[PDB]
Amino acid sequence: QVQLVESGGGSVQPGGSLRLSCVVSGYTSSSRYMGWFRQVPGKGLEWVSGIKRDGTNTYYADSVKGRFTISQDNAKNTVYLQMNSLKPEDTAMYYCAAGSWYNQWGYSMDYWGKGTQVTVSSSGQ
Amino acid sequence: NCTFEYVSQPFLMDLEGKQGNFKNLREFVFKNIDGYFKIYSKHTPINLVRDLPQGFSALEPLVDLPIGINITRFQTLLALHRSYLTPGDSSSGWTAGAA
C-alpha cells in the first residue's frame, strides 16, 4: 500500500556535504513521522533524525548536533536531510522510515524504505 | 491574540489645588483571585511631603474584571516629558516631574 523511495546517496571527501531525500506514497497523513536512520556494518540501527509533518518534534542524535539539518516538503510528500562537514565516522548505510508519533501514545516506525549509502573516504566509494 | 478589552469613565484625574508639594493621595488595592481581578481605590486630599499620613481610610471597590490570567509581576507606567524641544537640557533625552 505504501512505498518509501530514497535518493541522494554517494561518496564524499571528509569534511564535505551531502543531501539525502526520500518520498513517501501511500500514507493517509494525519501525524506522519519520517525519520532517518543509519546502519554501521556490524551494529544495529542508530537514530539519525526525525520530524513530524508540521509538528516539528525534530530529533537529532547527540553526536551529530549541527552536522545534519532536516526539512520537509508536504506538497511533494518528501523529507530532506542536509549534511555538512562529513567526518569519516559518518560512513554508513542510510534509511528513512515512516510512522506516527502521537504525542499522547508514542512512536511506531511502521514502514521502512530501500536505502542509500554514504561513504566518507579519501578516494570515493 | 487578545481576549478582553474594556473602557470606562476615568478615575485618575481628581487633583486639587495648584501649588502644593503633594496634595492628593490616591490608594488602590489590586487582588487577583479565582480569575477575577478586583480593583479597589480611594482618594484623600492631604498636603504633605514624604506622605502616607497616620489616618484611616476605607477603600471602596471600583471594578472586578474577569481576566483569567496568572499575574506574578507588575510595573507602573509614568508619562515622561521628552527633552528634545523643552527649554531645559533639550538635546535628545527626557525629563520627569516630581511624583
Partner: protein
C-alpha cells in the same frame, strides 16, 4: 519609589519604573500634583509568551 527629576546639578535623573513582584496582592499609593502615574501592567513573563 520616587519620580523626582529636579536635583542640584550634582546628580539628576531620579525616577523609578522597576518591575516588582505581585505575590498575593498589592497596595499602591500615589502622591502627585500632576498626572505622571498613568496606570499599570501585570503579567508573568512580559515578553510575548503569556
Amino acid at each position: 519609589f520616587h519620580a523626582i527629576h529636579v536635583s542640584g546639578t550634582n546628580g539628576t535623573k531620579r525616577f523609578d519604573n522597576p518591575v516588582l513582584p505581585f505575590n498575593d496582592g498589592v497596595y499602591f499609593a500615589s502622591t502627585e500634583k500632576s498626572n505622571i502615574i498613568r496606570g499599570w501592567i501585570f503579567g508573568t513573563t512580559l515578553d510575548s509568551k503569556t
